[PDB]
């Protein structure tokens, strides 16, 4: 339905979002995921830190350089979870994976575009209230990501600029709604209301 779909990753569950997105890429939809530092994983922070340490133990014994690579950024953690669900070793899998780019924060190509959510992977819609969850940025900076604060500063600046945008947009739409209400109850308005618009 869309050329590129921009997904705001905030408040989403990692596995459910990855299983949605992998099927979208295999069907041929182009997906870009922004704000990867705000993904959520169900479970305690200590459980997921222990899980990452169990993953971090695994390496090739005779040469650590050819072993499993333990990527530390939240976007690369999401990429790992998604590459697990795409059959990446085939040409179809590579062609699917080249339709995806995942970012921490919202870069300047995508800060002026529209962000969507996936309601079947949202934490507030999936988890029972009371279950504990993690933040992927906190887990990733606990296991070695170096750029948690610069992303926070850039996101603060971007949010200030976006609020400055939204004030003007709200004023303009209030003018347009006022003019539409005053130009209603004419004959064309009543004919459109009879016809359903």
């Amino acid at each position: 339905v869309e050329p590129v779909v921009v997904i705001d990753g905030k408040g989403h569950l990692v596995g459910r979002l990855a299983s949605v997105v992998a099927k979208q890429l295999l069907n041929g939809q182009k997906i870009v995921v922004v704000r990867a530092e705000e993904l959520n994983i169900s479970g305690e922070f200590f459980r997921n830190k222990l899980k990452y340490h169990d993953f971090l133990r695994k390496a090739t014994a005779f040469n650590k350089t050819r072993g499993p690579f333990h990527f530390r950024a939240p976007s690369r953690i999401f990429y790992k979870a998604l590459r697990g669900m795409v059959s990446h070793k085939t040409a179809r899998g590579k062609a699917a994976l080249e339709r995806l780019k995942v970012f921490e924060g919202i870069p300047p190509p995508y800060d002026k575009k529209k962000r969507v959510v996936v309601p079947q992977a949202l934490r507030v819609l999936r988890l029972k209230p009371g279950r504990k969850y993690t933040t992927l940025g906190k887990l990733s900076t606990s296991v070695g990501w170096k750029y948690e604060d610069v992303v926070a500063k850039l996101e603060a600046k971007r949010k200030v600029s976006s609020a400055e945008y939204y004030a003007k947009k709200r004023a303009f739409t209030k003018k347009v709604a006022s003019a539409n209400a005053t130009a209603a109850e004419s004959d064309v308005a009543k004919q459109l209301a009879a016809l359903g618009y």
Partner: protein, 106 residues
Amino acid sequence: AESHRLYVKGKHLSYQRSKRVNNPNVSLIKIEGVATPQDAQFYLGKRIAYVYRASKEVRGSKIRVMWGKVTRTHGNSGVVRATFRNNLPAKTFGASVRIFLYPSNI
């Protein structure tokens, strides 16, 4: 106007397959808009064209067409089964494809 589309867009998903054996004679098509077999029953018997391009001009055109039709619904989510004169080349998994509205019955 600015739009001239008289077909419905669809995606070529895969072949008919088991877990480890595929069957290229039957293709699986996701028609956009339909999400149930009862709505997919409208599209049975409709013609499908896969339209692609080539470098070498054959009979006045560089655009080649592969024709087929919808035969039955597939699953619970509005995917349909489609058969073509020559089977789809399997590099078109995820490629766009056109479902026309003829043969009509409305």
